[PDB]
């Protein structure tokens, strides 16, 4: 037979926790081939690219998810995070901010985990001001 896109995402999720980020990204890629219209495949592969320090690759997958779901709190948060590492402070804090009001409007039980990144991003900016 051949695994479903859901099973490929699940296998990729396991390799991510397993710290095999190249392998996890490849599983997400095969999921995408089976069904290219599921946003979480892209955000999760982008997260792989952040860990591997391939920041352009992670930007692209975050942008692809935002085309599928412009309201994605997760895609904005990963996009904001990625831009923070590239010293693109002004972009990171804008995207991190939009994840915050989007999480507000959707009433999501995430926690102080977006404000934390937002504070650290804004005050890492004032260093290299």
């Amino acid at each position: 037979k051949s695994p479903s896109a859901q099973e490929l995402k699940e296998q990729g999720n396991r390799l991510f926790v397993g710290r095999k980020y190249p392998e996890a990204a490849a599983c997400y890629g095969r999921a995408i081939t089976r069904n290219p219209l599921v946003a979480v495949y892209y955000t999760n592969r982008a997260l792989c690219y952040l860990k591997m320090q391939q920041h352009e690759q992670a930007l692209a997958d975050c942008r692809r998810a935002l085309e599928l779901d412009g309201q994605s709190v997760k895609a904005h948060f990963f996009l904001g995070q990625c831009q923070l590492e590239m010293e693109s402070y002004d972009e990171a804090i804008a995207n991190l901010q939009r994840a915050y009001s989007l999480a507000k409007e959707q009433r999501l039980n995430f926690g102080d985990d977006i404000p934390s990144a937002l504070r650290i991003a804004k005050k890492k900016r004032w260093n290299s001001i």
Binding site: N13, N44, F77
Partner: peptide, 10 residues
């Protein structure tokens, strides 16, 4: 909490 974000599909 990178696991929580990873599993988040909403």
């Amino acid at each position: 909490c990178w696991e929580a974000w990873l599993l988040c599909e909403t």
